[PDB]
C-alpha cells in the first residue's frame, strides 16, 4: 500500500496561481485515478477534481488537476484564487488493498483585510441566576488575523480562573469567530459593579463592560 | 440481417443535444471489434457490461443515441452527474447498462468561420427525467413571470455552441454516441 | 439532486459497537454502477476511507479496519448502514456516507470501481467517551443598550456530546444569525451561544425564539428571548 504526502500548509496571494503537490510514496502515480476534495471549515467535503483532471458541475473553471509523474506526484492547480478557496484540500488514490487519502493542504490567501473584532458581551440572565449559576459570554465575531487574547476583569483587577475561552474558528464569510465564557456563582456577579471583557487583537483592545440590577 | 452501427457513427451531420435522435437496432447481428479498437475514441466507458465481453453476449435491443456536445461537456454523459447537459438535455439513468462513446470531431464539425449549428438547452423549468427530451423551443419564461406578454422576460432556452478550429479542447465539437442495452441483437464468437 | 443523509447515535460507549445508518434520497440504493461507502475524519486530523458496498453485496474494506467493520444494505428502507465494533477512544470522528463515481469497464475491459466519492453527506458526529449524555441548559441572552441594531441570543450551557444545532424563529431568521463554536470546558462538557443581530426597533413588536436541538438527548428547546428592565 502507500502514503500520500501533501504539504500541510500553503499560501499564495489573490490572483496568481497555486499548486498542491501530493506525492505518492511507493507504486507509480497514474496507475490509479486521483480525486481532490475541497473541505471548508464546519462543512462537508465536496469533490472538485476526479479521474486525475476532470471537473464536476458547479466547480470553477480555474480548478485544473494534473499528474506530475517525474517526482511520482499529483497536482491540484487553481488560477485566479479568490478568497472563496480558503479551505483544506485532500488528494485520494488507491491500490489493491484500500484507499489512501492525503493529509490535507490548508490553503489560505494572505492579502485580505486586517479586521479588528466586534465584541458583544452578555450578562448572566435572570433565568440562569435562579438556577444558581452565572456565565458571562464574550462574543468576538468578524475579526482577521485569527488570534485574539481575551482577558477579563473583577471591577478594576483581573480574573485568573473561571475563564473558558474557545480557540478561533474560521467563519464562512472567511473572517473569524471565538467565544469566551466566565462561569461564576450568582453572588460574585452581584458583588462587583462592572465585569469587563478585554479583547486584545493586534494591540487594539476592544473592551466591553456590564453591571448588575 | 446486419446491425447498422456505422450508419449512426459515420453520418455527416449529427443532431444537437437539445434534439438528439435515436435509431432502434433490431433483428440483426452486431460486431464489437470496430468498437473495441477504434482508437479515435477519446472517451469510451461501459457501465455494468464489459466492452471486451460484448462479443460474447445477447441483448433484447440496442438503442443508439447520438448528438454533439462540446469537449468540456462530454463527462456530463455519466450516471449521476448534473449540469445542463445532464439536467436539461441528456440525463443518463443511474441503472444504465450500456456504453458512452465520444471522439474528437474538431476536424469535421468546426470551421474557422463559426459553426453555430449545434445547440444546447441551458435553461429549463424542471429537471429532465432519464431518456426524455424537450425538442420544443417555447421561449423560457423565468419559471412563473410569463414570456410573451410584451417581451418582458423570457431568456430563450436554447443557447448554441460556436465551434472553432482555433479554440482549445473546452470549446471543440465531440460527436457523442451512447449505445444503451436492454434476444434479437447478439454478437459473433458468441 | 441525489442527497446523502447520516443518522447516528452521538455516543458509542468504549469497546461497544457503533450503530450508523445512511438515508439515501434521489436515486436507488439498488443501482449497480454506484458504490456506497463511508469516510471518517477524526477532529483536527485528516480523512480516511472505511468500507464500501454495492447491492451486488461485493464489499471492499480498509484492511486496517476489516476485523471490526461490517457494512450492510437495507433496500426496502433505501439505506446502507455501518457496524464498527471494538471501538477505541481514537475512533472519535465525523462519519460521511458517500456515493462513488459510477463503475465502468473501459476501452480494454478494465473494470474501474469504488474509486472516489462523489455525492457527500452532511456528517453526524460520533463521540467515543465513557460518561453518558447530558442535555443542554438553554438560557436566553436578552438585549439591552444595542449599537443601532440590537443583538440577542441563546446561551446553550453544559452538554455532552456535540452537536447541538440552533436555528432561530424556526428557520425564518437567517440573516444576522451567527452561531459560534462550543468551548471544551474544564469538566468534559460543552457550551455554545447563538447570536442574532436583529433590528433595534422591533423588540416589543417582533417575537424572537431560538430553537436548540440537541439530538443526542432528544432535546428540542424552543426558548423565547424577550428584553430586560434596567
Ligand atoms: C467509420 O469510418 C471509418 C472510415 O471512414 C472506418 O474505418 C475503417 O474500419 C475498417 C474496419 O475493418 C478498417 O479495416 C479500415 O482500415 C478503416 N479505414 C479508415 C480509413 O479508418 C470505421 O470502421 C467506421 N466506424 C464504424 C463504427 O463503423
Amino acid at each position: 500500500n502507500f502514503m500520500l504526502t501533501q504539504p500541510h500548509s500553503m499560501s499564495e496571494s489573490p490572483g496568481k496561481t497555486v499548486t498542491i503537490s501530493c506525492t505518492r510514496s511507493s507504486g507509480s502515480i497514474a496507475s490509479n485515478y486521483v480525486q481532490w476534495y475541497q473541505q471548508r471549515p464546519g462543512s462537508s467535503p465536496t469533490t472538485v477534481i476526479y479521474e486525475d483532471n476532470q471537473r464536476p458541475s458547479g466547480v470553477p473553471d480555474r480548478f485544473s488537476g494534473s499528474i506530475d509523474s517525474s517526482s511520482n506526484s499529483a497536482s491540484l492547480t487553481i488560477s485566479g484564487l479568490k478568497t472563496e478557496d480558503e479551505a483544506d484540500y485532500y488528494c485520494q488514490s488507491y491500490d489493491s488493498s484500500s484507499w489512501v487519502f492525503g493529509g490535507g493542504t490548508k490553503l489560505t490567501v494572505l492579502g485580505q483585510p486586517k479586521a479588528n473584532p466586534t465584541v458583544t458581551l452578555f450578562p448572566p440572565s435572570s433565568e440562569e441566576l435562579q438556577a444558581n449559576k452565572a456565565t458571562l459570554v464574550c462574543l468576538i465575531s468578524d475579526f482577521y488575523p485569527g488570534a485574539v487574547t481575551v482577558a477579563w476583569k473583577a471591577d478594576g483587577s483581573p480574573v485568573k480562573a473561571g475563564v473558558e475561552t474557545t480557540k478561533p474558528s474560521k467563519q464562512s464569510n472567511n473572517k473569524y469567530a471565538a467565544s469566551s465564557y466566565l462561569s461564576l456563582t450568582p453572588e460574585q456577579w452581584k458583588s462587583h459593579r462592572s465585569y469587563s471583557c478585554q479583547v486584545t487583537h493586534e494591540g487594539s483592545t476592544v473592551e466591553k463592560t456590564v453591571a448588575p440590577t | 440481417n446486419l446491425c447498422p452501427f456505422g450508419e449512426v457513427f459515420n453520418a455527416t451531420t449529427f443532431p444537437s443535444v437539445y434534439a438528439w435522435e435515436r435509431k432502434r437496432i433490431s433483428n440483426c447481428v452486431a460486431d464489437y471489434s470496430v468498437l473495441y479498437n477504434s482508437t479515435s475514441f477519446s472517451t469510451f466507458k461501459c457501465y455494468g457490461v464489459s466492452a471486451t465481453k460484448l462479443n460474447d453476449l445477447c441483448f433484447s435491443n440496442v438503442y443508439a443515441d447520438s448528438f454533439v456536445v462540446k469537449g468540456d461537456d462530454v463527462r456530463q454523459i455519466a450516471p449521476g452527474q448534473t449540469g445542463v447537459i445532464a439536467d436539461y438535455n441528456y440525463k443518463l439513468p443511474d441503472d444504465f447498462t450500456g456504453c458512452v462513446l465520444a471522439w474528437n470531431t474538431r476536424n469535421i464539425d468546426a470551421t474557422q468561420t463559426g459553426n453555430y449549428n449545434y445547440k444546447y438547452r441551458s435553461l429549463r423549468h424542471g429537471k429532465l427525467r432519464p431518456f426524455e427530451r424537450d425538442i420544443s423551443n417555447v421561449p423560457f419564461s423565468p419559471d412563473g413571470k410569463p414570456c410573451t406578454p410584451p417581451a418582458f422576460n423570457c431568456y430563450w432556452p436554447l443557447n448554441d455552441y460556436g465551434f472553432y478550429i482555433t479554440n482549445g479542447i473546452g470549446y471543440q465539437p465531440y460527436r457523442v454516441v451512447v449505445l444503451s442495452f436492454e434476444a434479437t441483437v447478439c454478437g459473433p464468437k458468441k | 439532486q441525489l442527497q446523502l443523509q447520516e443518522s447516528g447515535p452521538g455516543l458509542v460507549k468504549p469497546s461497544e459497537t457503533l450503530s450508523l445508518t445512511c438515508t439515501v434520497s434521489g436515486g436507488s440504493i439498488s443501482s449497480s454502477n454506484f458504490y456506497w461507502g463511508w469516510i471518517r475524519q477524526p477532529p483536527g486530523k485528516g480523512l480516511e476511507w472505511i468500507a464500501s458496498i454495492t447491492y451486488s453485496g461485493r464489499t471492499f474494506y480498509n484492511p486496517s479496519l476489516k476485523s471490526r467493520v461490517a457494512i450492510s444494505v437495507d433496500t426496502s428502507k433505501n439505506q446502507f448502514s455501518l457496524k464498527l465494533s471494538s471501538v477505541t477512544a481514537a475512533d472519535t470522528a465525523v462519519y460521511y456516507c458517500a456515493r462513488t463515481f459510477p463503475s465502468y469497464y473501459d476501452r480494454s475491459g478494465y473494470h474501474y470501481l469504488n474509486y472516489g466519492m462523489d455525492v457527500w453527506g452532511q456528517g453526524t458526529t460520533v463521540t467515543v467517551s465513557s460518561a453518558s449524555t447530558k442535555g443542554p441548559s438553554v438560557f436566553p441572552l436578552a438585549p439591552s443598550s444595542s449599537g443601532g441594531t440590537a443583538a440577542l441570543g441563546c446561551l446553550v450551557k453544559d452538554y455532552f456530546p456535540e452537536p447541538v444545532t440552533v436555528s432561530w424563529n424556526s428557520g425564518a431568521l437567517t440573516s444576522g444569525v451567527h452561531t459560534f463554536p462550543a468551548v471544551l470546558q474544564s469538566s468534559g462538557l460543552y457550551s455554545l451561544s447563538s447570536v442574532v443581530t436583529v433590528p433595534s426597533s422591533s423588540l416589543g413588536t417582533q417575537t424572537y425564539i431560538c430553537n436548540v436541538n440537541h439530538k443526542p438527548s432528544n432535546t428540542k428547546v424552543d426558548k423565547k428571548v424577550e428584553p430586560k428592565s434596567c
Side-chain angles (χ1 to χ4, degrees), chain B residues 5-11 31 33-35 37-38 41 101 103:
Chain B
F5 285 166
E7 306 204 319
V8 182
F9 270 72
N10 264 296
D31 179 46
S33 59
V34 293
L35 303 177
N37 52 351
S38 178
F41 298 164
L101 195 147
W103 68 112

Side-chain angles (χ1 to χ4, degrees), chain B residues 64-153:
Chain B
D65 300 327
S66 55
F67 44 88
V68 172
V69 292
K70 63 176 182 170
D72 206 46
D73 279 350
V74 174
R75 62 181 183 264
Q76 294 219 31
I77 312 298
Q81 173 92 72
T82 51
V84 290
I85 300 297
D87 289 329
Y88 297 166
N89 286 309
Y90 195 76
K91 191 72 215 67
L92 269 190
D94 294 351
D95 54 352
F96 161 77
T97 307
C99 296
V100 168
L101 195 147
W103 68 112
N104 168 71
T105 42
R106 190 265 304 170
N107 290 322
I108 71 168
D109 309 319
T111 308
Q112 306 182 354
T113 304
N115 192 3
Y116 285 80
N117 272 274
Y118 290 128
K119 296 188 155 204
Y120 71 104
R121 179 180 288 100
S122 76
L123 294 161
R124 202 167 182 267
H125 202 273
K127 281 199 192 324
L128 189 73
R129 181 73 196 141
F131 290 170
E132 194 163 8
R133 183 152 35 106
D134 196 13
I135 54 167
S136 77
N137 215 17
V138 293
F140 175 62
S141 57
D143 296 331
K145 324 180 65 67
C147 167
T148 319
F152 278 162
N153 45 359

Side-chain angles (χ1 to χ4, degrees), chain B residues 70-73 104 167-174:
Chain B
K70 63 176 182 170
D72 206 46
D73 279 350
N104 168 71
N167 291 140
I169 57 153
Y171 308 107
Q172 275 175 19
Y174 274 46

